[PDB]
PDB file of C-alpha atoms in Angstrom:
ATOM      1  CA  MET C 147     -13.652 -19.176  29.397  1.00 41.32           C
ATOM      2  CA  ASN C 148     -15.861 -16.210  28.508  1.00 40.99           C
ATOM      3  CA  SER C 149     -15.879 -14.111  31.675  1.00 41.00           C
ATOM      4  CA  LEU C 150     -17.823 -11.448  29.783  1.00 42.05           C
ATOM      5  CA  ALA C 151     -16.867  -8.088  31.270  1.00 44.84           C
ATOM      6  CA  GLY C 152     -20.313  -6.688  30.443  1.00 44.39           C
ATOM      7  CA  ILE C 153     -23.522  -8.284  31.713  1.00 45.00           C
ATOM      8  CA  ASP C 154     -26.358  -8.845  29.272  1.00 45.23           C
ATOM      9  CA  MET C 155     -24.314  -7.193  26.506  1.00 44.81           C
ATOM     10  CA  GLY C 156     -24.029  -8.591  22.986  1.00 41.68           C
ATOM     11  CA  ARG C 157     -21.326  -8.002  20.386  1.00 43.11           C
ATOM     12  CA  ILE C 158     -21.282  -7.269  16.647  1.00 42.84           C
ATOM     13  CA  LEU C 159     -18.570  -7.205  13.988  1.00 46.03           C
ATOM     14  CA  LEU C 160     -17.755  -4.122  11.962  1.00 44.52           C
ATOM     15  CA  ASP C 161     -16.110  -3.956   8.541  1.00 44.55           C
ATOM     16  CA  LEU C 162     -14.193  -0.731   7.847  1.00 43.34           C
ATOM     17  CA  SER C 163     -11.438   0.176   5.412  1.00 42.05           C
ATOM     18  CA  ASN C 164      -7.880   0.665   6.646  1.00 40.61           C
ATOM     19  CA  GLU C 165      -8.096   4.379   5.874  1.00 41.43           C
ATOM     20  CA  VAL C 166     -10.944   4.587   8.386  1.00 41.73           C
ATOM     21  CA  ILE C 167      -8.909   2.888  11.114  1.00 44.85           C
ATOM     22  CA  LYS C 168      -6.430   5.735  10.730  1.00 49.34           C
ATOM     23  CA  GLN C 169      -9.225   8.278  11.206  1.00 50.83           C
ATOM     24  CA  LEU C 170     -10.493   6.557  14.346  1.00 53.45           C
ATOM     25  CA  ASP C 171      -6.966   6.220  15.693  1.00 52.31           C
ATOM     26  CA  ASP C 172      -6.471   9.978  15.434  1.00 53.10           C
ATOM     27  CA  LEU C 173      -9.712  10.504  17.345  1.00 55.71           C
ATOM     28  CA  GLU C 174      -8.662   7.881  19.874  1.00 55.43           C
ATOM     29  CA  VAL C 175      -5.342   9.621  20.493  1.00 55.53           C
ATOM     30  CA  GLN C 176      -6.888  13.007  21.262  1.00 55.83           C
ATOM     31  CA  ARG C 177      -9.580  11.344  23.364  1.00 56.63           C
ATOM     32  CA  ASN C 178      -7.127   8.776  24.690  1.00 58.98           C
ATOM     33  CA  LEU C 179      -9.921   6.199  24.560  1.00 57.11           C
ATOM     34  CA  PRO C 180     -10.549   2.875  22.733  1.00 57.57           C
ATOM     35  CA  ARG C 181     -12.490   2.832  19.468  1.00 59.46           C
ATOM     36  CA  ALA C 182     -15.146   0.558  20.944  1.00 55.18           C
ATOM     37  CA  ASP C 183     -15.957   3.372  23.349  1.00 54.75           C
ATOM     38  CA  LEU C 184     -16.154   5.843  20.464  1.00 50.22           C
ATOM     39  CA  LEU C 185     -18.312   3.549  18.347  1.00 47.49           C
ATOM     40  CA  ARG C 186     -20.794   2.974  21.157  1.00 47.77           C
ATOM     41  CA  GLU C 187     -21.206   6.726  21.528  1.00 45.10           C
ATOM     42  CA  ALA C 188     -21.607   7.089  17.769  1.00 47.14           C
ATOM     43  CA  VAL C 189     -24.583   4.723  17.682  1.00 46.80           C
ATOM     44  CA  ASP C 190     -26.214   6.119  20.813  1.00 47.34           C
ATOM     45  CA  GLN C 191     -25.840   9.578  19.300  1.00 47.32           C
ATOM     46  CA  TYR C 192     -27.248   8.351  15.990  1.00 44.34           C
ATOM     47  CA  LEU C 193     -30.354   6.913  17.645  1.00 44.80           C
ATOM     48  CA  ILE C 194     -30.897  10.107  19.612  1.00 42.85           C
ATOM     49  CA  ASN C 195     -30.754  12.168  16.428  1.00 39.13           C
ATOM     50  CA  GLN C 196     -32.991   9.703  14.596  1.00 42.51           C
ATOM     51  CA  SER C 197     -35.565   9.722  17.402  1.00 44.12           C
ATOM     52  CA  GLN C 198     -36.265  13.086  19.013  1.00 42.15           C
ATOM     53  CA  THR C 199     -39.103  14.876  17.216  1.00 43.01           C
ATOM     54  CA  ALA C 200     -41.824  14.150  14.654  1.00 44.22           C
ATOM     55  CA  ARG C 201     -43.886  17.342  14.637  1.00 43.13           C
ATOM     56  CA  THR C 202     -41.549  18.872  12.061  1.00 44.90           C
ATOM     57  CA  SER C 203     -42.128  15.990   9.657  1.00 44.73           C
ATOM     58  CA  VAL C 204     -45.509  15.396   8.030  1.00 42.62           C
ATOM     59  CA  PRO C 205     -47.410  12.248   6.879  1.00 44.03           C
ATOM     60  CA  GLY C 206     -46.435  10.873   3.471  1.00 43.09           C
ATOM     61  CA  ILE C 207     -48.779  10.659   0.478  1.00 46.69           C
ATOM     62  CA  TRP C 208     -51.906   8.561   1.000  1.00 49.76           C
ATOM     63  CA  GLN C 209     -55.402   8.816  -0.470  1.00 47.55           C
ATOM     64  CA  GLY C 210     -56.033   5.557  -2.335  1.00 48.52           C
ATOM     65  CA  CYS C 211     -56.920   7.436  -5.518  1.00 48.38           C
ATOM     66  CA  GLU C 212     -59.100   5.791  -8.162  1.00 48.04           C
ATOM     67  CA  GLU C 213     -62.478   6.278  -6.476  1.00 49.81           C
ATOM     68  CA  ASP C 214     -65.679   4.532  -7.543  1.00 50.54           C
ATOM     69  CA  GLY C 215     -68.748   6.273  -8.952  1.00 54.46           C
ATOM     70  CA  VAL C 216     -72.151   5.821 -10.584  1.00 56.03           C
ATOM     71  CA  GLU C 217     -70.404   5.371 -13.929  1.00 57.04           C
ATOM     72  CA  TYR C 218     -73.546   6.584 -15.703  1.00 55.85           C
ATOM     73  CA  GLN C 219     -72.973   9.647 -17.896  1.00 55.22           C
ATOM     74  CA  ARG C 220     -71.770   9.518 -21.496  1.00 55.58           C
ATOM     75  CA  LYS C 221     -74.475  10.933 -23.754  1.00 58.33           C
ATOM     76  CA  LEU C 222     -73.486  14.619 -23.768  1.00 57.74           C
ATOM     77  CA  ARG C 223     -70.618  14.144 -21.320  1.00 62.11           C
ATOM     78  CA  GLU C 224     -68.181  15.657 -23.809  1.00 61.02           C
ATOM     79  CA  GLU C 225     -68.236  19.435 -24.236  1.00 60.88           C
ATOM     80  CA  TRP C 226     -70.148  20.106 -21.023  1.00 61.43           C
TER      81      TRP C 226
ATOM     82  CA  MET Z  49      -7.194   3.985  -7.464  1.00 62.37           C
ATOM     83  CA  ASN Z  50      -5.168   0.944  -8.499  1.00 64.06           C
ATOM     84  CA  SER Z  51      -7.969  -1.381  -7.398  1.00 67.06           C
ATOM     85  CA  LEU Z  52     -11.286  -1.319  -5.528  1.00 68.51           C
ATOM     86  CA  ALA Z  53     -14.204  -3.493  -4.438  1.00 67.95           C
ATOM     87  CA  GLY Z  54     -11.406  -5.672  -3.079  1.00 68.06           C
ATOM     88  CA  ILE Z  55     -11.642  -7.570   0.214  1.00 68.61           C
ATOM     89  CA  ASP Z  56      -9.300  -6.315   2.923  1.00 69.03           C
ATOM     90  CA  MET Z  57     -11.408  -4.327   5.392  1.00 70.63           C
ATOM     91  CA  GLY Z  58     -10.317  -4.529   9.025  1.00 72.22           C
ATOM     92  CA  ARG Z  59     -12.759  -6.225  11.392  1.00 72.65           C
ATOM     93  CA  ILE Z  60     -13.882  -4.434  14.553  1.00 72.55           C
ATOM     94  CA  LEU Z  61     -16.081  -5.719  17.354  1.00 73.09           C
ATOM     95  CA  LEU Z  62     -18.788  -3.495  18.814  1.00 70.25           C
ATOM     96  CA  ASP Z  63     -20.332  -4.084  22.250  1.00 68.66           C
ATOM     97  CA  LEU Z  64     -23.921  -2.896  22.735  1.00 70.49           C
ATOM     98  CA  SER Z  65     -26.727  -3.663  25.155  1.00 68.52           C
ATOM     99  CA  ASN Z  66     -28.992  -6.460  23.909  1.00 69.34           C
ATOM    100  CA  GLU Z  67     -31.975  -4.156  23.855  1.00 69.95           C
ATOM    101  CA  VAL Z  68     -29.835  -2.149  21.445  1.00 69.10           C
ATOM    102  CA  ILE Z  69     -29.748  -4.939  18.849  1.00 66.06           C
ATOM    103  CA  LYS Z  70     -33.530  -4.663  18.873  1.00 68.05           C
ATOM    104  CA  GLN Z  71     -33.484  -0.874  18.442  1.00 69.03           C
ATOM    105  CA  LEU Z  72     -31.269  -1.261  15.387  1.00 73.63           C
ATOM    106  CA  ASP Z  73     -33.596  -3.929  14.043  1.00 72.64           C
ATOM    107  CA  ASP Z  74     -36.494  -1.477  14.057  1.00 70.97           C
ATOM    108  CA  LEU Z  75     -34.414   1.027  12.104  1.00 69.72           C
ATOM    109  CA  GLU Z  76     -33.016  -1.618   9.777  1.00 69.72           C
ATOM    110  CA  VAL Z  77     -36.428  -3.178   9.172  1.00 66.41           C
ATOM    111  CA  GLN Z  78     -38.412   0.048   8.873  1.00 64.71           C
ATOM    112  CA  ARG Z  79     -35.863   1.371   6.393  1.00 66.98           C
ATOM    113  CA  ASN Z  80     -35.550  -2.056   4.764  1.00 66.92           C
ATOM    114  CA  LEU Z  81     -31.782  -1.997   4.248  1.00 65.72           C
ATOM    115  CA  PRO Z  82     -28.584  -3.784   5.399  1.00 64.08           C
ATOM    116  CA  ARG Z  83     -27.402  -2.892   8.907  1.00 64.93           C
ATOM    117  CA  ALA Z  84     -23.821  -2.605   7.703  1.00 66.43           C
ATOM    118  CA  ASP Z  85     -24.954   0.407   5.693  1.00 64.15           C
ATOM    119  CA  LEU Z  86     -26.570   1.948   8.769  1.00 64.46           C
ATOM    120  CA  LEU Z  87     -23.399   1.473  10.769  1.00 61.92           C
ATOM    121  CA  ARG Z  88     -21.147   2.840   8.040  1.00 62.25           C
ATOM    122  CA  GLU Z  89     -23.103   6.092   7.874  1.00 63.73           C
ATOM    123  CA  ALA Z  90     -23.268   6.129  11.670  1.00 62.43           C
ATOM    124  CA  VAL Z  91     -19.498   6.301  12.048  1.00 64.11           C
ATOM    125  CA  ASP Z  92     -18.953   8.477   8.982  1.00 64.58           C
ATOM    126  CA  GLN Z  93     -21.605  10.886  10.233  1.00 66.77           C
ATOM    127  CA  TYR Z  94     -19.870  10.967  13.608  1.00 63.09           C
ATOM    128  CA  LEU Z  95     -16.509  11.700  11.999  1.00 61.75           C
ATOM    129  CA  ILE Z  96     -17.964  14.552   9.959  1.00 59.08           C
ATOM    130  CA  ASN Z  97     -19.505  16.154  13.041  1.00 61.00           C
ATOM    131  CA  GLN Z  98     -16.260  15.652  14.954  1.00 60.25           C
ATOM    132  CA  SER Z  99     -14.349  17.406  12.160  1.00 60.13           C
ATOM    133  CA  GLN Z 100     -14.968  21.074  12.971  1.00 61.22           C
ATOM    134  CA  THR Z 101     -11.252  21.616  13.605  1.00 64.25           C
ATOM    135  CA  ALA Z 102     -10.523  21.080   9.915  1.00 64.63           C
ATOM    136  CA  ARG Z 103      -8.160  24.060   9.681  1.00 66.50           C
ATOM    137  CA  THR Z 104      -6.470  22.724   6.553  1.00 64.33           C
ATOM    138  CA  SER Z 105      -4.077  20.466   8.451  1.00 64.12           C
ATOM    139  CA  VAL Z 106      -1.226  18.932   6.455  1.00 64.64           C
ATOM    140  CA  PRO Z 107       1.837  17.756   8.438  1.00 64.99           C
ATOM    141  CA  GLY Z 108       5.088  17.418   6.489  1.00 65.16           C
ATOM    142  CA  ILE Z 109       5.721  14.038   8.110  1.00 63.36           C
ATOM    143  CA  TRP Z 110       2.289  12.955   6.887  1.00 64.48           C
ATOM    144  CA  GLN Z 111       1.664  11.148  10.170  1.00 65.14           C
ATOM    145  CA  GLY Z 112       4.564   8.977  11.334  1.00 68.31           C
ATOM    146  CA  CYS Z 113       4.439   9.198  15.125  1.00 69.77           C
ATOM    147  CA  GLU Z 114       2.397   5.982  15.278  1.00 71.46           C
ATOM    148  CA  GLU Z 115       3.461   2.852  13.411  1.00 67.03           C
ATOM    149  CA  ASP Z 116       6.517   3.357  11.210  1.00 69.99           C
ATOM    150  CA  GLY Z 117       4.516   1.720   8.423  1.00 72.04           C
ATOM    151  CA  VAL Z 118       6.223  -1.599   7.649  1.00 75.94           C
ATOM    152  CA  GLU Z 119       4.842  -4.765   6.059  1.00 75.39           C
ATOM    153  CA  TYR Z 120       6.299  -7.951   4.582  1.00 76.86           C
ATOM    154  CA  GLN Z 121       5.010  -8.476   1.039  1.00 83.31           C
ATOM    155  CA  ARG Z 122       6.842  -8.237  -2.285  1.00 86.35           C
ATOM    156  CA  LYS Z 123       7.840 -11.909  -2.358  1.00 85.71           C
ATOM    157  CA  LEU Z 124       6.004 -13.922   0.282  1.00 85.28           C
ATOM    158  CA  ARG Z 125       3.367 -16.415  -0.865  1.00 82.87           C
ATOM    159  CA  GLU Z 126      -0.415 -16.263  -1.239  1.00 81.89           C
ATOM    160  CA  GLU Z 127      -1.419 -19.268  -3.338  1.00 81.99           C
ATOM    161  CA  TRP Z 128      -1.693 -19.056  -7.123  1.00 79.28           C
TER     162      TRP Z 128
END
């Protein structure tokens, strides 16, 4: 008998310590809203912060290193 | 701490929007780490940001307005 209040909306389980529940409760009291509502906003906010700009950041380290060559020297290679 | 790494974390259900599960996947995959870790930091990060009122609060009652704090243990039974 799953009426599903939300359409096309999934659900996930969250594991948090009891001490955390107390923290959320305090936030819920002041906001007078359910945790689920707070959690949803937390994620949405997280994604927004994660994805917003990329100009500030710069490409990692990439060059391949170890390049090939003629490999024909020796002789007086040293001290030269 | 008397004990840690124990199992007794409260379970909480989070409702998202399908397409959200995918968004998280990209972050979880790209970063190559457990989602639970991503969520944990998500909430914690939210709590930290929503903690600008930290004016050194410390009620004498130590929070007692909600839940008197009672549980049946001591004796009881939990297999042995």
